[PDB]
């Protein structure tokens, strides 16, 4: 996160650290959607151009954290991955469309004050909130600057920008499964997600039932916080039915 603040303890209880076994390293952010399921970005597991292709056995999921590096002794819970599922139409070859992956845990995690699942949006929630100028919130242990590392979890509140705008900001082809967010150079407020933040949650709070909803997944952007550029997220409501298929086809 660039230009954010440290997270309050217990503020984003669905945040998950995607952690690799060796070198012991932070690989990405993520979110807990139930007690056996985590959602992240498929770029986190598979990215051939970069020679990236991680298996269940290459990683751990760390849930309950605030500190980035320390091991949070009676606070964080560590899980082993049972199976990984990437969207069959993840397009890593051109614009990363359908960047989403499900991970199913070897055993369900117990909730606590620091471990709690985010809600998945329904059609009406997606419908009222996902509007240009509404602010959502991104979190991660990621870079503080494009080109260092926080000690604890960062948070930033960013506005959903109008499509055209998103569209005229890059040479990359944008698809209906994407959304961009960030301030405009004129707004005189800034912040973005950055490297290390991928797979984290872009969540919103419902005014109607006052529940938090995961609306997007951290995906791509050019640089971190550049004036006239926006961060792109996977539109979670649009990939919603693939989500229910796998969980039904395979879990819970």
């Amino acid at each position: 996160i660039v230009e954010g603040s440290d997270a309050e303890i217990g503020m984003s209880p669905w945040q998950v650290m995607l952690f690799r076994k060796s070198p012991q390293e932070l690989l990405c952010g993520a979110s807990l959607i139930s007690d056996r399921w985590v959602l992240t970005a498929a770029h986190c597991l598979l990215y051939p151009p970069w020679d990236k292709n991680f298996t269940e056995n290459d990683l751990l999921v760390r849930i309950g954290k605030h500190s980035r590096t320390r091991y949070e002794r009676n606070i964080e819970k560590i899980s082993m991955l049972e199976k990984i599922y990437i969207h069959p139409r993840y397009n890593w070859r051109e614009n990363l469309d359908r960047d989403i992956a499900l991970m199913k845990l070897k055993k369900p995690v117990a909730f606590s004050d620091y471990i709690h699942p985010v809600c998945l949006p329904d059609r009406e929630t997606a419908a009222s909130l996902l509007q240009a100028g509404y602010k959502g919130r991104v979190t991660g242990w990621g870079n503080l600057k494009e080109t260092g590392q926080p000690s604890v979890l960062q948070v930033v509140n960013l506005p959903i920008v109008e499509r055209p705008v998103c569209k005229d900001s890059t040479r990359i082809r944008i698809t209906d499964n994407m959304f961009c967010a960030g301030y405009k150079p004129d707004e005189g407020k800034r912040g973005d997600a950055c490297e290390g933040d991928s797979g984290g949650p872009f969540v919103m709070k419902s005014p109607f039932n006052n529940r938090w909803y995961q609306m997007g997944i951290v995906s791509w952007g050019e640089g971190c916080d550049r004036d006239g550029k926006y961060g792109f997220y996977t539109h979670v409501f649009r990939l919603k039915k693939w989500i229910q298929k796998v969980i039904d086809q395979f879990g819970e």
Partner: peptide
């Protein structure tokens, strides 16, 4: 939606307490 008890934070909403910047979000919701 995406849980059952989902989206209600034990330390905040469950105790009726607000995080320091949730009002900015809530204030954009036009």
């Amino acid at each position: 939606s995406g849980e059952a008890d989902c989206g209600l934070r034990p330390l905040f909403e469950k105790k009726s307490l607000e995080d320091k910047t949730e009002r900015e979000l809530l204030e954009s919701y036009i």
